[PDB]
């Protein structure tokens, strides 16, 4: 278990487009605000909370279509464009930039490719 | 049920609804269902039909099924079970 920490970064409407780029996308600052100091039993529980918070934030979720909205509403990761998928990895991932497990300044949202 | 021709159009639409509503048993079941949609349709856009649809048709399970039905027919492929 662990407490989530860190600040994240300001992001724009199309922030998941950056997840496809070489940096990846940061955890949005608004999400970091919501999860900071919260306790999580595992990285999977933290990941669920990130996507649930994305689903609740009209600005971070507005560029997801209704099918993708359904996914994040359940705390599931949204599906990437087909050309960013590999193997059975078809959804956005949370990678550590590497270094603490729940440090949101150390986590990047990425596509599989 | 093994290929798309084992499904009626109603059954296939209920399956697309399941995917669109994220109503698999778990997140990994949703992933399997998306991959199964890809296998069954053989459509080269795959999951983009569900999540990243072209803007000249409706973004809904109806619209997705319409696109698949039309694409399979126009490309000489088998269709839904009667």
Provide a descriptive summary of the structure in words.
The complex is a heterodimer of chains A (113) and B (82). With 113 residues, chain A is of the alpha+beta class. Chain A has a single domain (1-113), classed as Colicin/pyocin, DNase domain (Colicin E7 immunity protein, Chain B, fragment: Endonuclease domain, Alpha-Beta Complex), CATH 3.90.540.10. Chain A is 34% helix and 12% strand. Chain A is built from five helices and five strands, in the order βαβαβαααββ. Chain A has helices at 15-19, 29-35, 43-56, 58-61, 66-73, and strands at residues 2-3, 25-26, 39-40, 93-96, 107-110. In chain A, helix 3 (43-56) crosses helix 5. Chain A is globular and about 35 Å long. In chain A, 33% of the residues are buried. Chain B is an all-alpha fold and 82 residues long. Chain B has a single domain (1-82), classed as Orthogonal Bundle (Non-ribosomal Peptide Synthetase Peptidyl Carrier Protein, Chain A). The chains are: A alpha+beta (113), B mainly alpha (82). Chain A binds chain B through residues 65-68, 70-71, 73-74, 76-79, 81-82, 85, 88, 90-91, and chain B through 19-22, 27, 30-31, 34-35, 45-48, 50-53, 59-60.
């Amino acid at each position: 278990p662990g407490k989530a920490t860190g600040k994240g970064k300001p992001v724009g409407d199309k922030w998941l487009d950056d997840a496809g780029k070489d940096s990846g996308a940061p955890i949005p600052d608004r999400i970091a605000d919501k999860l900071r100091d919260k306790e999580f039993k595992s990285f999977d529980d933290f990941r669920k909370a990130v996507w649930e918070e994305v689903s609740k934030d009209p600005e971070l979720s507005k560029n997801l279509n209704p099918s993708n909205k359904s996914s994040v509403s359940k705390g599931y990761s949204p599906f990437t464009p087909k050309n960013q998928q590999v193997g059975c990895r078809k959804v956005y991932e949370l990678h550590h930039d590497k270094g603490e497990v729940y440090d949101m300044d150390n986590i990047r949202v990425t596509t599989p490719k | 049920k093994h290929s798309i021709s084992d499904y009626t159009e109603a059954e296939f639409l209920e399956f697309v609804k399941k995917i669109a509503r994220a109503e698999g048993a778990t997140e990994c079941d949703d992933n399997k269902l998306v991959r199964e949609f890809e296998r069954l349709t053989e459509h080269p856009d795959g999951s983009d039909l569900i999540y990243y649809p072209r803007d000249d048709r409706e973004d809904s399970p109806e619209g997705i099924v319409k696109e698949i039905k039309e694409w399979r027919a126009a490309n000489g492929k088998s269709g839904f079970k009667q």
